[PDB]
Amino acid sequence: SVTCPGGQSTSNSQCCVWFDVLDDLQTNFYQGSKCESPVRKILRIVFHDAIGFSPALTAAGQFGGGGADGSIIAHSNIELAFPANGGLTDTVEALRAVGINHGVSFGDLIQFATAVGMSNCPGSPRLEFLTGRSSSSQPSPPSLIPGPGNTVTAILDRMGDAGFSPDEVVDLLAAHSLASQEGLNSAIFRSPLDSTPQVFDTQFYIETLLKGTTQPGPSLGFAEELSPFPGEFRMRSDALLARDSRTACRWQSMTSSNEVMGQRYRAAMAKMSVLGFDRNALTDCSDVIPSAVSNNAAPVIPGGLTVDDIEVSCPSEPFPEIAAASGPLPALAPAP
Ligand code: HEM
Numbered sequence: 001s002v003t004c005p006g007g008q009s010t011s012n013s014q015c016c017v018w019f020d021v022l023d024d025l026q027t028n029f030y031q032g033s034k035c036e037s038p039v040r041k042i043l044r045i046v047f048h049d050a051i052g053f054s055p056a057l058t059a060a061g062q063f064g065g066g067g068a069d070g071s072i073i074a075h076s077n078i079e080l081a082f083p084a085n086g087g088l089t090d091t092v093e094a095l096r097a098v099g100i101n102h103g104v105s106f107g108d109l110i111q112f113a114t115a116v117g118m119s120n121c122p123g124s125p126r127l128e129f130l131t132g133r134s135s136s137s138q139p140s141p142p143s144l145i146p147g148p149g150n151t152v153t154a155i156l157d158r159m160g161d162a163g164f165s166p167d168e169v170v171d172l173l174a175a176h177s178l179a180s181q182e183g184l185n186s187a188i189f190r191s192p193l194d195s196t197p198q199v200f201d202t203q204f205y206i207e208t209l210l211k212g213t214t215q216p217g218p219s220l221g222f223a224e225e226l227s228p229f230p231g232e233f234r235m236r237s238d239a240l241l242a243r244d245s246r247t248a249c250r251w252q253s254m255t256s257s258n259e260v261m262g263q264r265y266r267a268a269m270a271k272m273s274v275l276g277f278d279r280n281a282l283t284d285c286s287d288v289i290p291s292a293v294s295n296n297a298a299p300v301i302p303g304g305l306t307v308d309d310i311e312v313s314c315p316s317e318p319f320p321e322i323a324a325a326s327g328p329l330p331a332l333a334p335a336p
């Protein structure tokens with residue numbers, strides 16, 4: 001054990017510098033430890049930075065990518081040019097300063113900012129945090145980020161290559177529980193992906209399984225599908241992953257328990273944090289991460305909609321018991 005200059009107790013001396021970052025982020029980046037756009041933007045960044053890792057590319061005789069090496073910040077000039085990394089310039093430049101200023105690696109900062117950002121949203125699990133990733137990285141190979149226009153096979157092959165199973169792909173997507181879209185359908189900027197974009201819960205999995213009956217904007221975006229109610233946006237890849245035979249059962253079990261969903265996500269996020277790295281070579285500083293406020297609310301089927309409105313895609317397994325909320329049907333306001 002060690003006590004930092006600030007008095008904080010921690011499991012290792014290199015966990016001490018992190019208490020100053022945590023202080024910085026919460027105060028400025030997060031405008032007061034808040035669960036808004038910054039946290040959602042950072043979640044896109046952590047996924048997009050880590051996923052630039054392909055053992056298959058390497059085998060083919062090409063640079064496969066450095067995984068969670070912070071190249072998205074280190075080589076933003078190249079990476080932010082990728083169509084998948086739109087609307088991230090400011091989050092990146094914001095993170096770059098914090099990183100330099102505090103002298104921490106970009107790969108560690110992104111991973112740290114993620115665990116910290118998650119704590120600002122009610123119901124989030126306490127994501128593990130390891131420190132010690134090299135500060136040096138190369139730009140990520142293009143075309144390594146799965147898109148909403150991609151097929152389930154495309155997405156699973158890409159994610160499988162990176163090291164994730166179909167079930168883990170579903171688990172990582174629990175992140176869409178705190179999300180919205182700004183560039184898929186600009187007409188309805190920031191339309192939430194679920195009824196609670198500020199609460200880490202199972203609503204995302206539940207609501208994506210409801211029958212698509214609503215077009216929230218003047219038109220149906222390129223990679224957009226009908227949603228269950230006004231204000232909610234449904235991404236084509238999410239709609240397909242929820243119903244595909246290869247992933248439907250995992251998606252289905254992720255609707256009943258907030259704790260289980262949280263467990264699986266944390267296990268998945270911990271997997272993604274060390275892509276291109278050796279766990280043994282990193283120092284655990286998980287104790288620097290604050291706990292998120294509890295989510296006592298239980299899973300429910302929104303606005304007078306019943307379980308019979310759910311398009312059950314894994315009938316081989318019993319559909320979980322979930323409370324049903326009375327109407328009227330909701331109309332989501334844009335994500336804060
Ligand atoms: C596996 C296939 C995935 C696809 C196809 C996908 C796609 C997308 C897209 C196209 C948007 C809309 C961005 C915009 O127009 O603002 C979005 C939002 C978001 N995504 Fe994903 N995603 C995937 C996985 C993940 C993962 C694994 C994480 C992190 C663990 C993540 C976190 C987020 C968050 C928090 C937003 C919200 C951003 C905001 O409100 O500005 N996604 N995603």
Ligand SMILES: [Ca+2]
Pocket residue numbers: 048049050051052066067068069070071072140
């Ligand atoms: Ca990277």
Ligand SMILES: [Ca+2]
Pocket residue numbers: 176177178194195196197198199200201202203204
């Ligand atoms: Ca939610």
